[PDB]
Amino acid sequence: GDQIDTYELSGGARINRIFHERFPFELVKMEFDEKELRREISYAIKNIHGI
Amino acid sequence: GDQIDTYELSGGARINRIFHERFPFELVKMEFDEKELRREISYAIKNIHGI
User: Fold this and answer.
1) How far apart are CA A40 and CA A34, in angstroms?
2) Residue B39: is it exposed, middle or buried by C-beta count within 10 angstroms (0-12/13-18/19+)?
3) For a tag site, which of A4, A11, A33, B7 has the least CB within 10 Å?
4) How far is CA A25 from its chain centroid?
5) Measured between alpha carbons, how far is B24 from B18 in angstroms, rounded to an integer?
6) CA distances from residue A28 to A19, A24, A31 in whole angstroms, order as listed
7) Hey, are the CB atoms on A4 and B51 less than 8 Å from each other?
8) Residue of B36, B41, B43 with shortest CB distance to A10
9) How far is A19 from chain B (nearest CA, A)?
10) Chain B residue with minimal CA distance to A20?
């Protein structure tokens, strides 16, 4: 339709699209310690071989 | 007709024609801030897409 808010603010569902392109920001806060990744890879190999 | 004011002054409707060619001067006082035009274009595009 017509009669849009050309000057004031983003409103309605244009905020939702921000969620859809802010979720990528939440997906990169999931930090991890590298040395824990190497530790767990090592213990995984050892437990997978077995005897 | 005859008997016009060849030396003294513009008079009668020759002032009106000045209005007709001064209105163009009123039409160029309508100044705007450019960064507000860009702001409003931006918020218009964002509100037009929507979700």
Assistant:
1) 10
2) middle
3) B7
4) 5
5) 10
6) 15, 7, 7
7) no
8) B43
9) 10
10) B51
